[PDB]
mmCIF file with all atom_site columns, C-alpha atoms in Angstrom:
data_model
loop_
_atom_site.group_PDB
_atom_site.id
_atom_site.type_symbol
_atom_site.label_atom_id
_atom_site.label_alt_id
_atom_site.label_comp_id
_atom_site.label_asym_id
_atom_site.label_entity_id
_atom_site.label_seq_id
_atom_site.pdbx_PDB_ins_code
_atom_site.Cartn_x
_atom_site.Cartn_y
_atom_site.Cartn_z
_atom_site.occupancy
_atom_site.B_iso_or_equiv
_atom_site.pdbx_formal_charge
_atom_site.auth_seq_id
_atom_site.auth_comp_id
_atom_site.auth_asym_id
_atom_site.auth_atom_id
_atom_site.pdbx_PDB_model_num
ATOM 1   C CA . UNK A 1 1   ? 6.439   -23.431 4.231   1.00 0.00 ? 1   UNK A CA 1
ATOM 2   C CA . UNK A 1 2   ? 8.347   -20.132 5.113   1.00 0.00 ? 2   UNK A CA 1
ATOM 3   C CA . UNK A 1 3   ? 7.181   -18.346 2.490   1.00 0.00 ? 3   UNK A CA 1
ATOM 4   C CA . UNK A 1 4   ? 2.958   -17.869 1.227   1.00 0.00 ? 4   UNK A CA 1
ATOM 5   C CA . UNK A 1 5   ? 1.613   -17.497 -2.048  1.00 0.00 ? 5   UNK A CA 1
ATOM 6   C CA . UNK A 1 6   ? -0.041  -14.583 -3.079  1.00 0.00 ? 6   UNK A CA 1
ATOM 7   C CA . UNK A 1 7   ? -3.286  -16.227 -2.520  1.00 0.00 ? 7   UNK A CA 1
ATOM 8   C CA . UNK A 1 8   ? -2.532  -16.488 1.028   1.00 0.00 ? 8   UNK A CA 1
ATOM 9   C CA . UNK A 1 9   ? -1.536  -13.078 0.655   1.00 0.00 ? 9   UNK A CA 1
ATOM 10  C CA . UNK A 1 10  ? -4.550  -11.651 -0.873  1.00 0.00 ? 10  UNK A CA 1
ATOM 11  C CA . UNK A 1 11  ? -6.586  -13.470 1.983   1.00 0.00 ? 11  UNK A CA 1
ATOM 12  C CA . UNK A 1 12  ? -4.225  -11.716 5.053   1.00 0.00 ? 12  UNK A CA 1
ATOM 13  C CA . UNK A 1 13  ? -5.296  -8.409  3.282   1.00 0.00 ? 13  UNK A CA 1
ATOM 14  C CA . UNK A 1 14  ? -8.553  -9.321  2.814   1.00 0.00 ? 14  UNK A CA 1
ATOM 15  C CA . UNK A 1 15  ? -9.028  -9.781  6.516   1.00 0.00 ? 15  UNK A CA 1
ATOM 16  C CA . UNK A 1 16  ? -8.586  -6.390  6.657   1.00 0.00 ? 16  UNK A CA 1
ATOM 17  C CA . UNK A 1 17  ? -9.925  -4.968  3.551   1.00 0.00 ? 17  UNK A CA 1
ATOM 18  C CA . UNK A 1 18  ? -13.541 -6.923  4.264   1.00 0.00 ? 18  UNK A CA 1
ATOM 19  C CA . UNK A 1 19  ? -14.227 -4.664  6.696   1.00 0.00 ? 19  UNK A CA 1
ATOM 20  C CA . UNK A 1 20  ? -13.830 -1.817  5.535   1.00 0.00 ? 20  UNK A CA 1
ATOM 21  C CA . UNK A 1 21  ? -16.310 -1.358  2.842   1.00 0.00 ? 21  UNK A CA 1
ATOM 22  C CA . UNK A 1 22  ? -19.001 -1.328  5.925   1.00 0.00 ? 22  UNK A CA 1
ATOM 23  C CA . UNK A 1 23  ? -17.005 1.876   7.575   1.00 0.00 ? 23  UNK A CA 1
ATOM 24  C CA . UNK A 1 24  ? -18.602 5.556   6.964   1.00 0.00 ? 24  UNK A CA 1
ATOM 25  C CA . UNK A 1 25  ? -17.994 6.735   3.362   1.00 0.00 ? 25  UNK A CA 1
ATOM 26  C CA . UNK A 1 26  ? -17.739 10.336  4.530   1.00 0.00 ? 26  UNK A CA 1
ATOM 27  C CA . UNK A 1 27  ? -14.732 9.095   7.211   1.00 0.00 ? 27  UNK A CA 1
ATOM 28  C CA . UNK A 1 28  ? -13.186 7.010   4.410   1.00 0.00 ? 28  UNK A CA 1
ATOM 29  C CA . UNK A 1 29  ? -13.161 10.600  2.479   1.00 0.00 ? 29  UNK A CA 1
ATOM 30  C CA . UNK A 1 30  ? -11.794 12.512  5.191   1.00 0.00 ? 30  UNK A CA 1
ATOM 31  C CA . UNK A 1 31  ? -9.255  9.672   6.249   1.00 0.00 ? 31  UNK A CA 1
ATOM 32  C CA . UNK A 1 32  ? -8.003  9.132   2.185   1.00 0.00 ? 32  UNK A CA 1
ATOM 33  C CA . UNK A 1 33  ? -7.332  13.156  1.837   1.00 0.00 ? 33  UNK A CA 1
ATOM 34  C CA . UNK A 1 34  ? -5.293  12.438  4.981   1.00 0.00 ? 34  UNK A CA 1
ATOM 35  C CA . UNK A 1 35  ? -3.269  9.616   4.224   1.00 0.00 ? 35  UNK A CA 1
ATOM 36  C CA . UNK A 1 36  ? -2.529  11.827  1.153   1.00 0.00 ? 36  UNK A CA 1
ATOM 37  C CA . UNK A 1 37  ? -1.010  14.220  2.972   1.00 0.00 ? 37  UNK A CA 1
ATOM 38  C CA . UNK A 1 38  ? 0.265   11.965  5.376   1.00 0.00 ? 38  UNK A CA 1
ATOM 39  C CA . UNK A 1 39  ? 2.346   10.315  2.511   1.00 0.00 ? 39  UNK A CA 1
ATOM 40  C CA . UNK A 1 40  ? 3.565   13.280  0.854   1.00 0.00 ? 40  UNK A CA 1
ATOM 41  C CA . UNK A 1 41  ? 5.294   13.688  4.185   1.00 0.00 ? 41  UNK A CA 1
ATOM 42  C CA . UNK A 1 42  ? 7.718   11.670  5.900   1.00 0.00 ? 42  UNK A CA 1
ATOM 43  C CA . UNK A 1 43  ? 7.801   13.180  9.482   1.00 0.00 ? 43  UNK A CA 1
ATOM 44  C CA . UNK A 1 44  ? 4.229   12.956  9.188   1.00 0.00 ? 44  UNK A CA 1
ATOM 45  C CA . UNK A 1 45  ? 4.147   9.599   8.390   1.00 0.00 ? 45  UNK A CA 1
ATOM 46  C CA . UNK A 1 46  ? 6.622   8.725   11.398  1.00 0.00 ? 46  UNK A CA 1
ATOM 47  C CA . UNK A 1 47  ? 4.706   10.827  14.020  1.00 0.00 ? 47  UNK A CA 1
ATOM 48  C CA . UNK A 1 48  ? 1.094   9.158   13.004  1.00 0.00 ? 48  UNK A CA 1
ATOM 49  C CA . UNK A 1 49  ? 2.901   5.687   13.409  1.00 0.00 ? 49  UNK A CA 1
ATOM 50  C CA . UNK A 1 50  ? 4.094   6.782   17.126  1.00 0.00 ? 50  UNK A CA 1
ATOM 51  C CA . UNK A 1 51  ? 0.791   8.235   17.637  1.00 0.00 ? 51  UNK A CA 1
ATOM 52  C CA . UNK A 1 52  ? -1.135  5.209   17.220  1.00 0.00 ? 52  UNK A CA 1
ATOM 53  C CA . UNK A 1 53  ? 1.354   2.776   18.279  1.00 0.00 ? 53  UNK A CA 1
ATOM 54  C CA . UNK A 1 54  ? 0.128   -0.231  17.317  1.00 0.00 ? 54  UNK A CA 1
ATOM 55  C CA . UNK A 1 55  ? -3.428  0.616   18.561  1.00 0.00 ? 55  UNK A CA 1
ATOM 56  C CA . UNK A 1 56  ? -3.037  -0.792  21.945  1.00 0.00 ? 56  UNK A CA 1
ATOM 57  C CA . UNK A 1 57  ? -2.869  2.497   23.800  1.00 0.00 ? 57  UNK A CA 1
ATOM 58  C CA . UNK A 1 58  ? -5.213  1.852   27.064  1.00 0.00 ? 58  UNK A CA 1
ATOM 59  C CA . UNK A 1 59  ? -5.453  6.006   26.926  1.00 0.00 ? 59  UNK A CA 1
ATOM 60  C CA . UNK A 1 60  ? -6.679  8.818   24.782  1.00 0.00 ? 60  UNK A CA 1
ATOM 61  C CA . UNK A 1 61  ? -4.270  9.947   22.128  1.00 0.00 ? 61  UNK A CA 1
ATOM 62  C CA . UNK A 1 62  ? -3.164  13.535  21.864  1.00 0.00 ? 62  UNK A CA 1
ATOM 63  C CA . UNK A 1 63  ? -4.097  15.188  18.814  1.00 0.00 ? 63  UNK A CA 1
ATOM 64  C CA . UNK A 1 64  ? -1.184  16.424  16.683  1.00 0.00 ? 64  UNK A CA 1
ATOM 65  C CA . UNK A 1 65  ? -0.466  18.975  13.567  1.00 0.00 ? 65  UNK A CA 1
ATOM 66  C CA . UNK A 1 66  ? -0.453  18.585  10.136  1.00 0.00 ? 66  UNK A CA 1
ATOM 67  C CA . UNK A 1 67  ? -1.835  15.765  7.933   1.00 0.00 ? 67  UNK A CA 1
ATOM 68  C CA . UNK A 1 68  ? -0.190  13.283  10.652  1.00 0.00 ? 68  UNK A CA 1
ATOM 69  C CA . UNK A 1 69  ? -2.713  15.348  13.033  1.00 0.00 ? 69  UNK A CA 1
ATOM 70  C CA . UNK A 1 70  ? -5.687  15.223  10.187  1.00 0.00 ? 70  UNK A CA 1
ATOM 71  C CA . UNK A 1 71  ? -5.508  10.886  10.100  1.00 0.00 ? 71  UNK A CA 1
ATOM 72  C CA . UNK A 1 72  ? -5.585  11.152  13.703  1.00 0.00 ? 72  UNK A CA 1
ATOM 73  C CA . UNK A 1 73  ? -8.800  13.072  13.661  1.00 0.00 ? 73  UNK A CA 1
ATOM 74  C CA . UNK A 1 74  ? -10.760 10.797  11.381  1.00 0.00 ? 74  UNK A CA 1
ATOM 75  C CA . UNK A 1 75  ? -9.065  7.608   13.898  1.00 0.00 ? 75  UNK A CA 1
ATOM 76  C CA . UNK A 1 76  ? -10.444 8.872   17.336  1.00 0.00 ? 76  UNK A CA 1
ATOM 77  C CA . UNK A 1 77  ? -14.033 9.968   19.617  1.00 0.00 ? 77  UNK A CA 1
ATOM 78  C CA . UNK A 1 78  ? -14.876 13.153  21.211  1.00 0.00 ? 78  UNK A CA 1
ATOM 79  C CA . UNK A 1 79  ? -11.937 12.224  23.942  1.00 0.00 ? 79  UNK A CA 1
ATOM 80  C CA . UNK A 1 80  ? -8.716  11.306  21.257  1.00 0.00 ? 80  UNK A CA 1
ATOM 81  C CA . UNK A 1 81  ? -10.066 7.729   22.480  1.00 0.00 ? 81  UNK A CA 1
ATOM 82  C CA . UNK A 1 82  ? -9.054  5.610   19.333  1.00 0.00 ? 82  UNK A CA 1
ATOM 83  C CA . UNK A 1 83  ? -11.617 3.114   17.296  1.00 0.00 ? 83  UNK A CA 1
ATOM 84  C CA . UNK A 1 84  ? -10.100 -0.095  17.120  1.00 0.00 ? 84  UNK A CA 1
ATOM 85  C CA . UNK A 1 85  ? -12.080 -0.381  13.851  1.00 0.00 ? 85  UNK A CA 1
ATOM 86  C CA . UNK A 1 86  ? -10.744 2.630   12.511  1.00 0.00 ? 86  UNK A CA 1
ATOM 87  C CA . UNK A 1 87  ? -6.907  2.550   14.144  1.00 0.00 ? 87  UNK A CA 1
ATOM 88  C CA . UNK A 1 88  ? -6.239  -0.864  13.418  1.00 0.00 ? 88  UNK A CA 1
ATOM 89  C CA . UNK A 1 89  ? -6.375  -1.030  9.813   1.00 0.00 ? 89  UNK A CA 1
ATOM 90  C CA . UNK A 1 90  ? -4.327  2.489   9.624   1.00 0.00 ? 90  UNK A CA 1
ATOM 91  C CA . UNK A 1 91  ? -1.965  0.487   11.466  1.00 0.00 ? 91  UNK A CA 1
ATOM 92  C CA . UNK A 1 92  ? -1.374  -2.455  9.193   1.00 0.00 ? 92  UNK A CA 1
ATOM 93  C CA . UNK A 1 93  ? -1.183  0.468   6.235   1.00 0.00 ? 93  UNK A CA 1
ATOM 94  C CA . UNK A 1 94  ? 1.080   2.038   8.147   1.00 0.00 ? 94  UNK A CA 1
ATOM 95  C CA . UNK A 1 95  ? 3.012   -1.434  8.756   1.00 0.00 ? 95  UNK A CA 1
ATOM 96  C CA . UNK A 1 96  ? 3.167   -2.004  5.307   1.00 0.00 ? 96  UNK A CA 1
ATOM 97  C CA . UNK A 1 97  ? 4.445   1.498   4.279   1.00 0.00 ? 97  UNK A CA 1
ATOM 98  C CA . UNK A 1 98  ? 7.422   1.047   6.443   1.00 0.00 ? 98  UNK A CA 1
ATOM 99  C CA . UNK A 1 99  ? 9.130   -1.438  3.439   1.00 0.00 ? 99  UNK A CA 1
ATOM 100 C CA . UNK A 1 100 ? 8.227   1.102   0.902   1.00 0.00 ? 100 UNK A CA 1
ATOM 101 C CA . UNK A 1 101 ? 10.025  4.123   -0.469  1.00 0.00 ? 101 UNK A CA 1
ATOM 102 C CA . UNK A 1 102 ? 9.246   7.804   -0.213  1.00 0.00 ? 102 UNK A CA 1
ATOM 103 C CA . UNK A 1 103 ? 9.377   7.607   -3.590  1.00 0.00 ? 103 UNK A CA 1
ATOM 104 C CA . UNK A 1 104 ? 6.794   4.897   -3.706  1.00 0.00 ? 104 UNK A CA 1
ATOM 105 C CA . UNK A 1 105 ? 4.977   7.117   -0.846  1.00 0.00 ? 105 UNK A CA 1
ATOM 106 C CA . UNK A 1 106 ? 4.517   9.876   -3.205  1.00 0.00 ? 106 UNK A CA 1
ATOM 107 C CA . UNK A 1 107 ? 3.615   7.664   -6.023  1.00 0.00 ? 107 UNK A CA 1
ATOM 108 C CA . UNK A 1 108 ? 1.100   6.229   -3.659  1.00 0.00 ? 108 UNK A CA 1
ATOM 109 C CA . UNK A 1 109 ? -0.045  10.166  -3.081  1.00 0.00 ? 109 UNK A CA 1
ATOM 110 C CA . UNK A 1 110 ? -0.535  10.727  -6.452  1.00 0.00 ? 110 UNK A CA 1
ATOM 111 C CA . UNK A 1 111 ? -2.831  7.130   -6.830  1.00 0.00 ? 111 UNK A CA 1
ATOM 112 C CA . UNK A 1 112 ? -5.081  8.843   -3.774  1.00 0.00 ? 112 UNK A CA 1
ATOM 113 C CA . UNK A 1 113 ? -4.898  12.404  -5.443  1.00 0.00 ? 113 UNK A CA 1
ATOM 114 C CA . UNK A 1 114 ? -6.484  11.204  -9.188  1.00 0.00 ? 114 UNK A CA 1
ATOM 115 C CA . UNK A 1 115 ? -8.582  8.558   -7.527  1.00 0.00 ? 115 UNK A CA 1
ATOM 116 C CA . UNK A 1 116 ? -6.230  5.704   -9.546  1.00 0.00 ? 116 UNK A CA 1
ATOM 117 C CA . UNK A 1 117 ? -5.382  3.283   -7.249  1.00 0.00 ? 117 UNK A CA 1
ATOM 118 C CA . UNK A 1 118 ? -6.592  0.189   -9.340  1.00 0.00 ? 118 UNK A CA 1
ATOM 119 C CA . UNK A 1 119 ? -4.549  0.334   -11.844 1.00 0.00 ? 119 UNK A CA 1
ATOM 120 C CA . UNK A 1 120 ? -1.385  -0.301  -9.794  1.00 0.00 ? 120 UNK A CA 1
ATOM 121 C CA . UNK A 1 121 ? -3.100  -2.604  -7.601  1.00 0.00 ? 121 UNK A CA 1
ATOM 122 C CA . UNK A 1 122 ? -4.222  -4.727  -10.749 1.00 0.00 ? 122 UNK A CA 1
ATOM 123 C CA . UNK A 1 123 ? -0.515  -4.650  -11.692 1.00 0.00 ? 123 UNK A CA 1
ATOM 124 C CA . UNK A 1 124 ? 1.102   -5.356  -9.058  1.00 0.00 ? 124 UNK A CA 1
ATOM 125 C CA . UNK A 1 125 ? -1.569  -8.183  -7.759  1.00 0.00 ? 125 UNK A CA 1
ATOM 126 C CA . UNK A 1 126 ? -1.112  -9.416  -10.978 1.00 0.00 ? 126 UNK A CA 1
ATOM 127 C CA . UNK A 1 127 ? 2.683   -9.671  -11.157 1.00 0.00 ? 127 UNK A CA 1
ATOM 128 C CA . UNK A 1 128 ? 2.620   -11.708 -7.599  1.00 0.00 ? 128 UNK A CA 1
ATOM 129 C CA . UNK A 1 129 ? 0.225   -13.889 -8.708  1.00 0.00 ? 129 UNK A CA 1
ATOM 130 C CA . UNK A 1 130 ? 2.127   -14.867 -12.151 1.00 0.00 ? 130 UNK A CA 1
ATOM 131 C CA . UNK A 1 131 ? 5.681   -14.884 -10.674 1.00 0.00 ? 131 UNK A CA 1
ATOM 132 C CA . UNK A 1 132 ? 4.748   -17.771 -8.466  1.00 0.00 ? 132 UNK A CA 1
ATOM 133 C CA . UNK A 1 133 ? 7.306   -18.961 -6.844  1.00 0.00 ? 133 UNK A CA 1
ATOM 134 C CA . UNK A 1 134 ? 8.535   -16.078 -5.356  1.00 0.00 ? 134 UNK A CA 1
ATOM 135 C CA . UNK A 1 135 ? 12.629  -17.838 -4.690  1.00 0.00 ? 135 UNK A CA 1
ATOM 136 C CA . UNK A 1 136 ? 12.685  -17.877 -7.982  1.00 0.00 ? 136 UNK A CA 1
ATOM 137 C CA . UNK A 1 137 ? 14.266  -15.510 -10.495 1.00 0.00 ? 137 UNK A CA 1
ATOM 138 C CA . UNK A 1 138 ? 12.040  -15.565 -13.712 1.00 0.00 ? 138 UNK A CA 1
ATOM 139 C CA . UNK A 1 139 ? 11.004  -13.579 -16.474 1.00 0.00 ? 139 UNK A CA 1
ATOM 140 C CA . UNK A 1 140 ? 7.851   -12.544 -17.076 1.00 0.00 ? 140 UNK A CA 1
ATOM 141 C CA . UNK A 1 141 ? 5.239   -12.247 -19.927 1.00 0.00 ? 141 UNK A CA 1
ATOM 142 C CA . UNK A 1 142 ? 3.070   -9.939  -19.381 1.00 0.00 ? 142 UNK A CA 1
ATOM 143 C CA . UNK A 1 143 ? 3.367   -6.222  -20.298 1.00 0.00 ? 143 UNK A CA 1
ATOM 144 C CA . UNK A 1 144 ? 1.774   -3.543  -18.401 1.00 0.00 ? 144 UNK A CA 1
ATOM 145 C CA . UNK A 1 145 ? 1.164   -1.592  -21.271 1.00 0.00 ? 145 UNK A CA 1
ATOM 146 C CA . UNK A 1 146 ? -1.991  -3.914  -22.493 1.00 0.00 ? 146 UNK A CA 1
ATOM 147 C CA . UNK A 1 147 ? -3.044  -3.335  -18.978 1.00 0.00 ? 147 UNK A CA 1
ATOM 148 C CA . UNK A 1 148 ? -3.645  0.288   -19.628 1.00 0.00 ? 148 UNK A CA 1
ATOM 149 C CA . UNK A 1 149 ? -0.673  1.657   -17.812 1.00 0.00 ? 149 UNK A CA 1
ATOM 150 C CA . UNK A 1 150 ? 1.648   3.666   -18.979 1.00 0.00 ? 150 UNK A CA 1
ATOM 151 C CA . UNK A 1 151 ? 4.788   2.026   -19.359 1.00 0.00 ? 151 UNK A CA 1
ATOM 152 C CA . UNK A 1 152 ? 8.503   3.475   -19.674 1.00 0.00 ? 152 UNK A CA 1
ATOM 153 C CA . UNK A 1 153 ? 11.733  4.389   -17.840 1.00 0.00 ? 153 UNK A CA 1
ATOM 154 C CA . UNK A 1 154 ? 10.406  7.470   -15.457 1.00 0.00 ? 154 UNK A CA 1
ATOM 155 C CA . UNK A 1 155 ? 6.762   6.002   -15.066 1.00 0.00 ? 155 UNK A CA 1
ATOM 156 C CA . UNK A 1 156 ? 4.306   5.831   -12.352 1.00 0.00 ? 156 UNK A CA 1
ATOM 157 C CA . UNK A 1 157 ? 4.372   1.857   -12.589 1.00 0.00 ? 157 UNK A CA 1
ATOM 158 C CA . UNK A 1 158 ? 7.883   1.598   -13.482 1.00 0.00 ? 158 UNK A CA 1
ATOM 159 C CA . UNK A 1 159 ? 9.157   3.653   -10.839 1.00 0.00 ? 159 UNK A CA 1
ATOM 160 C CA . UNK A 1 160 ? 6.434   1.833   -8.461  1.00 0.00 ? 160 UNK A CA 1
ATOM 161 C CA . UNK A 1 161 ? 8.282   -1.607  -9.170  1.00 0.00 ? 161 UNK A CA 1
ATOM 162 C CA . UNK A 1 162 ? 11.694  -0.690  -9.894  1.00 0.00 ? 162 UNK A CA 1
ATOM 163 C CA . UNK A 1 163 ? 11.698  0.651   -6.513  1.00 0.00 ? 163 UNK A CA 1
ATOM 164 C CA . UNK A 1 164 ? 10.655  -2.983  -5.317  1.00 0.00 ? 164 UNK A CA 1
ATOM 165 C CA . UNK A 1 165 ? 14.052  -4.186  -6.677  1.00 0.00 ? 165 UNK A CA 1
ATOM 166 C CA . UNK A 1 166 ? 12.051  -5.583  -9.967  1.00 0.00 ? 166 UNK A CA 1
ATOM 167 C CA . UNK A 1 167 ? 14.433  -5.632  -13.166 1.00 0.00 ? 167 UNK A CA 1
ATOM 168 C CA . UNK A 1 168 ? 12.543  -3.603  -15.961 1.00 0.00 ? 168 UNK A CA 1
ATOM 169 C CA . UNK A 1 169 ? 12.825  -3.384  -19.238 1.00 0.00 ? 169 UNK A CA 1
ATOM 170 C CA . UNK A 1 170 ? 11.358  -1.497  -22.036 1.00 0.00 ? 170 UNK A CA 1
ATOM 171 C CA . UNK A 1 171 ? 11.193  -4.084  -24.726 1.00 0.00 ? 171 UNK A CA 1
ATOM 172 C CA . UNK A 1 172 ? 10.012  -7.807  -23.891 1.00 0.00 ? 172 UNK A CA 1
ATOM 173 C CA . UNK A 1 173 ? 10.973  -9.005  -21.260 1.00 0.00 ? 173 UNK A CA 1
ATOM 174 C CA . UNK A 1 174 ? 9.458   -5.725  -19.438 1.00 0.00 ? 174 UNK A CA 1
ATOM 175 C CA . UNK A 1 175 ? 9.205   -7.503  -15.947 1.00 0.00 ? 175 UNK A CA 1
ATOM 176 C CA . UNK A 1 176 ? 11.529  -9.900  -14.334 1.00 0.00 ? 176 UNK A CA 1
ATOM 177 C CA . UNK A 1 177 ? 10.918  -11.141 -11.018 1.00 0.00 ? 177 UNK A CA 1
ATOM 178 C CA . UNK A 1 178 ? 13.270  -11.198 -8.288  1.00 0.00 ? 178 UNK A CA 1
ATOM 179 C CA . UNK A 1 179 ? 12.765  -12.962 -5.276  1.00 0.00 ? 179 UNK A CA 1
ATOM 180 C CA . UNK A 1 180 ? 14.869  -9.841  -3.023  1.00 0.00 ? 180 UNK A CA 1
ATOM 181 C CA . UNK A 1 181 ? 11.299  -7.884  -4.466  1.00 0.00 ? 181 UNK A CA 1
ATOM 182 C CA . UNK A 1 182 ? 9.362   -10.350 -2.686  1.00 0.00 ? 182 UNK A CA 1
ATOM 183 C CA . UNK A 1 183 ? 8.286   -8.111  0.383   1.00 0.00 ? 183 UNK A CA 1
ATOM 184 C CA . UNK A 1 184 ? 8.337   -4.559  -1.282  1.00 0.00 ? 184 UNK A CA 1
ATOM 185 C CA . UNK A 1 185 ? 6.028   -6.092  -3.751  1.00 0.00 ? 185 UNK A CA 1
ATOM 186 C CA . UNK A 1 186 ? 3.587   -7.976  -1.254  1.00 0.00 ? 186 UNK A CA 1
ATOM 187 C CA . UNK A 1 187 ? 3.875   -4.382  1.256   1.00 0.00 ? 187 UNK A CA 1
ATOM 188 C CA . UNK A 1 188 ? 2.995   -2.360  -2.119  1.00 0.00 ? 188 UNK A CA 1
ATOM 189 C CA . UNK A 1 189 ? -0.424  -4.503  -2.902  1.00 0.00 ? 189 UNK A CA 1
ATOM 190 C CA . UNK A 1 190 ? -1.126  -4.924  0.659   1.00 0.00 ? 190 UNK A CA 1
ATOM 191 C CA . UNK A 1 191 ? -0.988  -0.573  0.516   1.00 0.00 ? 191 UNK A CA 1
ATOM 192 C CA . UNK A 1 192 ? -2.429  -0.776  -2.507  1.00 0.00 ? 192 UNK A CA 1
ATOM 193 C CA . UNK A 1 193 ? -5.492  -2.915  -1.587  1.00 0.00 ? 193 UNK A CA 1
ATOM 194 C CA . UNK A 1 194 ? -5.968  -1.492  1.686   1.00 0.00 ? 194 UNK A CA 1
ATOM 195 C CA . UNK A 1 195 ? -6.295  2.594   0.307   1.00 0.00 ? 195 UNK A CA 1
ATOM 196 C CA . UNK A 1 196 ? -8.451  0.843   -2.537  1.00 0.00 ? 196 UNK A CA 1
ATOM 197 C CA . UNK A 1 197 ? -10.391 -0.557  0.108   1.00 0.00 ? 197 UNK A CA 1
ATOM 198 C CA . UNK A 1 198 ? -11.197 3.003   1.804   1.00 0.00 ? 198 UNK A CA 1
ATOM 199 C CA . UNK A 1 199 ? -11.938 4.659   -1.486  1.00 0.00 ? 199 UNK A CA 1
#
């Protein structure tokens, strides 16, 4: 099939997310309060993605300002040598930040800032798995309000999904899928699941 299902997609992350419970907790610290920064800034953003590459750089990287300059820190060795272990799952963030918003970036800054990024990620992994299959327009049951999230025009999780292309609503039906949502949605929980993983 072209498409997967968001079991397959919760494995791909997973692949990724495993391994990261076993990194440092005081680098995961460090490398969080710089993603923060990283996403509240959009040159930032672009420079650490150039930075890095894709992690294939045979050479040490040359440290740079600002938060783009602070990820980098927490990424390299004594010589701006780069840690595959370290580099390679900033890249797939990084990857998956590319479909997203600034908004959604700075939504995404704000999850990092109070320490609430399971919330969303329950939401949104949640949504994917109940609007199986993704071609398919369809509204949905479940309301994000009895998941604890606050729930209205100008909120955290509605502005998080409308920006996916989702059709909200405050009244039942509150979420309808659309399949055009499809990869904003899967980027946004892969995001999601990967900063979870670090915290």
């Amino acid at each position: 099939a072209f498409t997967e299902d968001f079991q397959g997609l919760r494995a791909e992350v997973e692949t990724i997310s495993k391994e990261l419970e076993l990194l440092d907790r005081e680098l995961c610290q460090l490398l969080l309060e710089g993603l923060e920064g990283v996403l509240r800034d959009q040159l930032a953003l672009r420079a650490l993605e150039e930075a890095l590459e894709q992690g294939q750089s045979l050479g040490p990287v040359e440290p740079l300002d600002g938060p783009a300059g602070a990820v980098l820190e927490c990424l390299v060795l004594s010589s701006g040598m780069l840690v595959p272990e370290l580099a390679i799952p900033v890249v797939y963030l990084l990857g998956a930040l590319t479909m997203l918003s600034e908004t959604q970036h700075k939504l995404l800054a704000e999850a990092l800032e109070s320490q609430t990024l399971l919330g969303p990620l329950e939401l949104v992994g949640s949504l994917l798995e109940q609007s199986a299959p993704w071609q398919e327009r369809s509204t949905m049951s479940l309301p994000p309000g009895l998941l604890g999230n606050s729930w209205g025009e100008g909120a955290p999780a509605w502005v998080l999904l409308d920006e996916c292309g989702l059709e909200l609503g405050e009244d039942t039906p509150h979420v309808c899928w659309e399949p055009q949502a499809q990869g904003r949605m899967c980027a946004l929980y892969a995001s999601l699941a990967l900063l979870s993983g670090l915290s």
